[PDB]
Amino acid sequence: TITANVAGTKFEIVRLVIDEMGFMKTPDEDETSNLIWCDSAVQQEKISELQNYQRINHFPGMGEICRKDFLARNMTKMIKSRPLDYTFVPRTWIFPAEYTQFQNYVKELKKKRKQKTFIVKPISLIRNSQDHLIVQEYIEKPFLMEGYKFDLRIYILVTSCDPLKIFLYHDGLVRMGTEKYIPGSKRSIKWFTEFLQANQHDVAKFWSDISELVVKTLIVAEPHVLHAYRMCRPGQPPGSESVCFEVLGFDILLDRKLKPWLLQINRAPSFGTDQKIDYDVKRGVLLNALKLLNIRTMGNYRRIYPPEDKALLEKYENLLAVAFQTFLSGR
Ligand SMILES: Nc1ncnc2c1ncn2[C@@H]1O[C@H](COP(=O)(O)OP(=O)(O)O)[C@@H](O)[C@H]1O
């Protein structure tokens, strides 16, 4: 029947959900399983060994948008081509590569008598070495919740890279700060939207900005993923359904003007469940994801690609044309 291999997971909610969908757990050494779940990223050879009926929870080449240094370099090549479309990414400087370039930006800022804050990630701040770090402009005026800075963790389901299909879960995690903000309690996004409603903010625009952010982010990753997949899977017929799917964890910060900024993409987000908020959300994320796969022999998900809007789809396909063009230039 429909079987599963949960040897590569350490989270009970993953096993719980898979057991709840009706999957029969195979012994760990069994590679025949219809579904193969692994927490961390998989070797490309493992994806190449799959059969066309099998489904694994990771795309090959997704590290181009998950690794903060790769994400910075690729987005940079994209900003230079399409700056108006990609404004959701704070300026980032990869070290020890863009050291001199970063110093020049500080030089101009000094002469202009202006000041900016900068965050250093693997974490500390700076107001202006040969180590592998990254420098990023610091969003100084974040959206505060009762005087508190918070983080958004949204969950993205990518079911295919050919044709590209992207789903956005309309719920997630909110990580409020410990001490109040000046220039960790957990909550749900569903609750945060109800907050925005009571405080009269456009919840629809919030989701729309988030959706466009994700698609345009995956658009940057698409040429990397598509090539890796096709070289990993040379035995797939022209219209063969995707062997790979993936649940990505987007870390996102909103500024005072409720503009969503991309911080990182986690291809291996913790599905741990110590609290009830973690349970309901993450179970719903995993359960509905397997539902959409429809493994044979949506719920709180909304398809953001391909969009029902024709005009928006045209813009996306234009960006994809640029993404693939930018892709060939680098390699
Ligand atoms: N460019 C940035 N601008 C403003 N605040 C940021 C920025 N980057 C991170 N913050 C904060 O830094 C924290 C993220 O820490 P990070 O090391 O990148 O990931 P992790 O959560 O695993 O520690 C978040 O609280 C986030 O709000």
- Listing DSSP states for 259-301 in one string gives -EEEEEEESS-----SSHHHHHHHHHHHHHHHHHHT----TTE
User: Could you tell me the distance, in angstroms and rounded to a whole number, from the CA of residue 233 to the centre of ligand 1?
Assistant: 36
Question: Maximum CA pair distance of the chain?
Answer: 70
Closest CA relative to residue 85, chosen from 217, 207, 205, 224: 217
- Taking the C-alpha atoms of residue 42 and residue 148, their distance in angstroms, rounded to an integer, is 37
CATH of 63-88+144-330, one of 3.40.50.10860, 3.40.50.300, 3.40.50.11540, 3.30.470.20: 3.30.470.20
Which residue's alpha carbon is at the smallest distance from atom 14 of ligand 1? 263
Other beta carbons within 10 angstroms of residue 193's beta carbon come to 17
Q: d(Cα 243, Cα 245) in Å, to the nearest integer?
A: 7
Task: Please state the atom number of ligand 1 nearest to the C-alpha of residue 90.
Answer: 1
Tokens standing for residue 252 = 């996102």
Give, rounded to a whole angstrom, the gap between the first and last alpha carbons of the chain.
43
Vertex 315 angle, CA 311 and 320, to 5°: 140
138 lines ligand 1 (CB under 6 A): yes
The token pair at 309 is 């809007």
Task: Tell me the CA–centroid distance for residue 118 and ligand 1, in Å.
Answer: 11
Contacts of 34 (CB under 8 A, 6+ apart): 2, 3, 4, 23, 53, 54, 55, 295
Query: Is the omega angle on the peptide bond into residue 260 within 30 degrees of 0, that is, cis?
Result: no
Tell me, using a 6 A CB cutoff, whether residue 116 lines ligand 1: no
Q: Which ligand 1 atom is at minimum distance from the Cα of 68?
A: 18
Shortest-distance Cα residue to atom 27 of ligand 1: 151
Q: Are 252 and 262 in contact (CB under 8 A)?
A: yes
Q: How far apart are CA 280 and CA 171, in angstroms?
A: 10
Distance CA 221, CA 327 (A): 10
144 CA distance to ligand 1 middle (Å): 15
User: Positive or negative CA dihedral for 238, 239, 242, 248?
Assistant: positive
**d(C-alpha 188, C-alpha 152), whole Å:** 9
Atom of ligand 1 nearest to the CA of 150: 27
| Ligand 1 centroid to residue 263 C-alpha, Å | 7
Which residues are paired to 176 by β-bridges?
150
Q: Is 125 in the pocket of ligand 1 (CB under 6 A)?
A: no
Helix (H) or strand (E) holding 94: strand 92-94
**Measured from the CB, is residue 186 less than 6 Å from ligand 1?**
no
Resolution expressed in Å: 2.5
If you measure from the C-alpha of residue 284 to the centroid of ligand 1, how many angstroms do you get, rounded to a whole number?
Answer: 26
- Discontinuities in the chain (C→N > 2.5 Å), after residue: 122, 128, 183, 297
Q: In the chain, which segments carry CATH 3.30.470.20?
A: 63-88+144-330
Centroid of chain to Cα 18: 22
Q: Is 16 in the pocket of ligand 1 (CB under 6 A)?
A: no
Question: Computed over its alpha carbons, how large is the radius of gyration of the chain?
Answer: 21
Tokens for 129, please give them: 């070495």
Nearest protein CA to atom 24 of ligand 1, as residue = 151
- Burial of residue 101 (number of CB atoms within 10 Å: 0-12, 13-18, 19+): exposed
Which class for 252: exposed (0-12), middle (13-18), buried (19 or more C-beta within 10 A)? buried
Sign of the dihedral through C-alpha 251, 254, 259, 261: negative
Q: Is 90 near ligand 1, meaning CB less than 6 Å away?
A: yes
